[PDB]
Amino acid sequence: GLLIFFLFIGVILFSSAVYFAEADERDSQFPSIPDAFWWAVVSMTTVGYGDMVPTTIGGKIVGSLCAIAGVLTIALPVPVIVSNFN
C-alpha cells in the first residue's frame, strides 16, 4: 500500500509540474494534468514507452527528476517485500 501510495504522490506531483512546464506550447503532448498521469507512471517505473515526452527545457528537467524520484520511490518498499518473500 505504501508503494502504491508513494507512486501516487509522485505521479500527481510530476504530472502537475510537467503539465505547466509544457502549458504554453502548441505541440504540448500533455493535454491536462490527469493526462500526464500516464506519462508520470511510465517514467517513474522507468518503462518509458515514449508515447508522451516533454519537449521544453523545463519539462525535461521535470522529466529527469521524475525518473530518478521514481527509482527511489520503488526502491524503498520493495526490499521489505523481497525480504518477506525470502
Q: Is 11 exposed, middle or buried (0-12, 13-18, 19+ CB in 10 A)?
A: buried
* Minimum distance, C-beta of residue 25 to a copy of itself, in the bound complex (Å): 14
According to CB under 8 A, which residues from 24 to 83 bind a copy of itself?
31-34, 38, 41-43, 45-51, 53, 60, 63-64, 67-68, 71-72, 74-76, 78-82
Separation between Cα atoms, residue 14 and residue 62, nearest integer Å = 7
Residue ranges that bind a copy of itself, judged by CB under 8 A: 2-7, 9, 12-13, 16-17, 19-20, 31-34, 38, 41-43, 45-51, 53, 60, 63-64, 67-68, 71-72, 74-76, 78-82, 85-86
